[PDB]
Amino acid sequence: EDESEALRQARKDAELTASADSVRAYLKQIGKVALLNAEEEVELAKRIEAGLYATQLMT
C-alpha cells in the first residue's frame, strides 16, 4: 500500500521517465516546486529588496 517500500519506488521510477514530449517534460519539471502564500511571498519580497539595496551599496 503506502508504507514498507510499496509505492515509493514506483513514484521514483515514474519520476525517472523520458517524457519525450517537451510540453509534458516542462510540466513535470514545473511540478517539483510547492505553491506559496501571502506570508512566503512577502518575506521573499523583503529578501529581494535587501539584495537590491546591498547591490546598490556595493556599486
Binding site: A20, Q29, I30
Partner: protein, 48 residues
Amino acid sequence: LYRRVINRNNRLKRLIDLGAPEIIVNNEKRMLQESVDALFDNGRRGRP
C-alpha cells in the same frame, strides 16, 4: 521553420542576458534544439 528557430534563439539570448532560473533557461534550450531538429528533419523525432 527559420522564423521559429530565430524566435527561440533570440528569446534564449534575452533570457540568459537578463538572468533567469535554470529550469526556464533549460526549457528554452530544449525548445531551440527541437526547433533546429524540426528545421532539418520535421517528424524524425516525436510528432512533426
